[PDB]
DNA sequence: GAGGCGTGGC
DNA sequence: GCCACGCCTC
């Protein structure tokens, strides 16, 4: 019933589900179980979601596609940034 | 662009 | 726990 806070000397930080903190203590560890097998990258994250993210910079994978114009990118965020330059 | 990070619906 | 959205920082 307990609202999930970090218990090491310095945190506090609390969140609102038990897999935000869980992510939250991969940092005071250094625990980062993800792995990315492209050749030569070696980067690890302790989220699976910033995998996924991270691997379409090697898989050219750019599912939101700008309407206005023929640009694409990997992430959402990286869209609605180009549509400002399309006002 | 890319990584770190907080959040929420399922 | 997954996955995606969105913001912050560089
Ligand atoms: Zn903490
Ligand atoms: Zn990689
Ligand atoms: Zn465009």
């Known amino acids: 019933t307990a ?35 492209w050749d030569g990258c070696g980067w690890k994250f302790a989220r699976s979601d910033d995998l996924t993210r991270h691997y379409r910079k090697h898989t050219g994978h750019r599912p939101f596609q700008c309407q206005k114009c023929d640009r ?14 399309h006002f």
């Open 3 to 37: 609202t999930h806070t970090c218990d090491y000397a310095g945190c506090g930080k609390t969140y609102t589900k038990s897999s935000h903190l869980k992510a939250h203590l991969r940092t005071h560890t250094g625990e980062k179980p993800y792995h990315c097998d």
């Open 72 to 85: 694409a990118f990997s992430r959402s965020d990286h869209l609605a940034l180009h549509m400002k330059r």
